[PDB]
Amino acid sequence: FFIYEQLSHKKNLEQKGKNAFDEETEELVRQAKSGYHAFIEGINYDEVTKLDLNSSVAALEDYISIAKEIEKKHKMFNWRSDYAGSIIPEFLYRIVHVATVKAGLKPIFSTRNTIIEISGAAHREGLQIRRKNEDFALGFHEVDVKIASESHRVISLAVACEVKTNIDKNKLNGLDFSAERMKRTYPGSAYFLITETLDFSPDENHSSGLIDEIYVLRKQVRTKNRVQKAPLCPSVFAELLEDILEISYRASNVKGHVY
Amino acid sequence: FFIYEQLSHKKNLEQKGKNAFDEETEELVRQAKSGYHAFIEGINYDEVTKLDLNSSVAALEDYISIAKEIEKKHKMFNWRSDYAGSIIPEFLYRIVHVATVKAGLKPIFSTRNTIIEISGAAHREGLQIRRKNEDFALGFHEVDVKIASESHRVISLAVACEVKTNIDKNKLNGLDFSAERMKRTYPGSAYFLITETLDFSPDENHSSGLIDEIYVLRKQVRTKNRVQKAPLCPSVFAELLEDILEISYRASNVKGHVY
Amino acid sequence: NPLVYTHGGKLERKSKKDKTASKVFEEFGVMEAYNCWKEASLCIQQRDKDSVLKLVAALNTYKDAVEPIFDSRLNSAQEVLQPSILEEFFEYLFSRIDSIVGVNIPIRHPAKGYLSLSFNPHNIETLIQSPEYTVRAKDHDFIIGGSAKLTIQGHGGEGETTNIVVPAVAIECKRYLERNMLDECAGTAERLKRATPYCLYFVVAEYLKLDDGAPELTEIDEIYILRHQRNSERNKPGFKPNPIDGELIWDLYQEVMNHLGKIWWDPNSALQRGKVF
Amino acid sequence: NPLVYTHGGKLERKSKKDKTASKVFEEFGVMEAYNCWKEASLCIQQRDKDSVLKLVAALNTYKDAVEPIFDSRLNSAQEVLQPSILEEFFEYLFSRIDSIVGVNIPIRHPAKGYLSLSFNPHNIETLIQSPEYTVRAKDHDFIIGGSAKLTIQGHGGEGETTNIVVPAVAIECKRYLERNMLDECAGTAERLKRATPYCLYFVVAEYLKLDDGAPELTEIDEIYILRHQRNSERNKPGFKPNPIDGELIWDLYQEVMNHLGKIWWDPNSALQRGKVF
């Protein structure tokens, strides 16, 4: 499946909207994305050099700068972690080199038991099998599962990521909680957290354990700079996005199970 | 299933032996156990008071004292964690009051993925589903599981225990490792460790986390006392075995899922 | 026997910084309702069953007066001053334990309950000379415990000292609890039991907003539902919001005091007893 | 630049306590083989690729002379002095790093690598006055790191000081590794990475006795199989025991030194770089 979570979001917003649809056409939104989408498309696999990663990032900022302004103007309400907060959870979604498969942007978290009755336990015991909706997941591969003729379709993941605009302390704690569950289900798996800008409210340094990397796309010291309506403007730096080959490298490594 | 892990062990030792079988008959072993087994049988459910728990323990020591001497004489070799090291992992194996079910003395630890090929992954992906052989397990209930038409028969446990003669430091560390795995699979579950005597080699105090209780059946300070061929002789105290109602209480509690 | 005054301090903070709120406070008598509540709480000095119920009645009176103003007339209030009401209430209830417990407890209010220490050396020379370490702690809405002072010196002899709080009881206070907030707690609980295995951990909610199927009760000691109501009831036909249940506050008061009244870690008591906690 | 002499000390211990062993040591020239090895190891003073291979050759010579005596002529030797051979070998290999690293490392031998601290108060007064705490540490066969001195003072002001070791590299040495021993390690690894996330952790085995299906490599940095042989080969037709591989010891030496040569924890280097470790 060719999953553009964001373009599918466009498909859905235009279809349900009408007022939002007139806005897309007048604001050049689908076009603006298509211009962006096509410029990346120029960047192929042979072009996954350092130079190409930067060219793609430049185009990304062009688009995200134009995306933000449409939501951040007078047009209008339901435009938060819906549209804007799903542009960066796609990118190099498809590799070329190894490209085993995956299994989508969600992963099967774990299972618990919850039966009503003794007779019901013999008949078919109730379970509760979890799966959170993470921003982006790349998997090793593949399954389904059945438990007493109850079948559920399995994703086993290599990498998982959230993408946020900014990270504070108390959110980071809950993000740590999510990762503990993840590692329990899937031992090898890497968990990344990716954000643009950092807002460490206490200066006190942060939780190393179970978060396998955090990345700052803007390298921007504080969010407040950007928030404070002022001269201060961040920059989406290509070098920051270039060093997220850690994911690709790890995925590839697990394919080749030898001595 | 009526599992006497120890009497089944007798069934097996007598059948394979011959020399061991002549020894059983002459040493009064099956008889000695039957005398013991019958005295406990006098202690029923109405008799599961404080007084009855002590009477049962007295009979237990009579038997275990006679069991030990047969192995610990000149008759002869394969008699370690085989025979005597399976007398205490039975006891009040069947309750009466709640008595939901269980699911035997083993529990399904967890699962990992191990496929050979891409085609094989589509066909039926290899997994490795663990199950250790613990001393005694009591379960809540119930399942089987299927993964890509691979079926495996599930035990979900309330309690788990090992029974050992003596506990040292480095063994306690590995016992801690076992418990982490257990708790991951089964959140609610209690893990007990039961031993007669304690041999804390460093005086340094011990790992609280994830071991839900350790019990000393002899209350005996040091194993060395017993090991050192001397006046020093331990006592299996009924009061120590009486306070292992924690297990029964917890099991019962989970049956009644209400407000 | 002191008080921190969590809620009252935040009312004082808000009336200087937010002139909308400052105006609304005085206009609708938030200040008066609070002072009534503060002084009425300080009046009940014995700790028998009946006395505690009287304390609970004072809390219910205050919320009845003040929360409708917050909900309808202010923006920055729901997670700014509303949750500190329960926090300050427990400050009152436990302000008189020093006498009972028989020593001076320094921590009876919100503070950061110690979880772990870990070493993160900047380089090799650093590790050897004096390594930098990190203390993780969780903000809790209400902690009863003691303070200590942790210290590391390396080969280079110059000390690193961090002020830490080792809890006896940690309590979380919510208006309504939903599962992503419970799961926050479920993960805290694991870590807190590891830090202080004989730390008691409660979750205090007025309403329950939980996801149908059996919640894990695993490792959280007790979860309190003080108004005995589901959150979905709040918009339903013939709804009347129940009072905070004085019997459950009493249960909590007793279980805390029982926890404080016991022997916690004892190697020789393990022997004779058998059981650790 | 010191040595602890793990194996040699245990040879010295044994020759006074066990007169069977004492007799066998002198009779079959264990002492001489050791002294040859000790002094031959101290002779190789540069640390280029070739030099390390020479060091490895000395180790192989010693094991060839001494291990057949231990296997056939002694009872209390297999897990009493045999495993300390590799432990002392690494003492030698790393005895010359102070000069390279540019500061005095106090720990280059077996010691107890810090894992965690947790508070276990005996009672309420205890918690408040000065709480008892516990430090868990794992015995490791070979640790490179620094020492520090951890300290807790309570309300009553009197301090509690424990000598701890915060590792840079921790190494486990086995003759042959099987899965229950690996799982011991797999659990250590989790805990050690949590204590010191930029601690490097290796498992050093001569033979592999592993359970067919894919082993988890998760969280252990590297696992060394120095003789490139399965344990089941040891009883098979035409078996010859391979030498300990100098290229892998070289790999280890380089990876250690690289680990020591880097910047570990840096908040500003996270920014500019992006990545923490």
Numbering used by the authors:
A (entry chain B), B (entry chain A): 6 to 264
C (entry chain C), D (entry chain D): 6 to 282
Copy text verbatim from the article accompanying this structure deposition:
BbvCI, a Type IIT restriction endonuclease, recognizes and cleaves the seven base pair sequence 5′-CCTCAGC-3′, generating 3-base, 5′-overhangs. BbvCI is composed of two protein subunits, each containing one catalytic site. Either site can be inactivated by mutation resulting in enzyme variants that nick DNA in a strand-specific manner. Earlier mutagenesis of these residues confirmed their catalytic nature and demonstrated that the site in the R1 subunit cleaves the bottom strand of the target site, while the site in the R2 subunit cleaves the top strand.
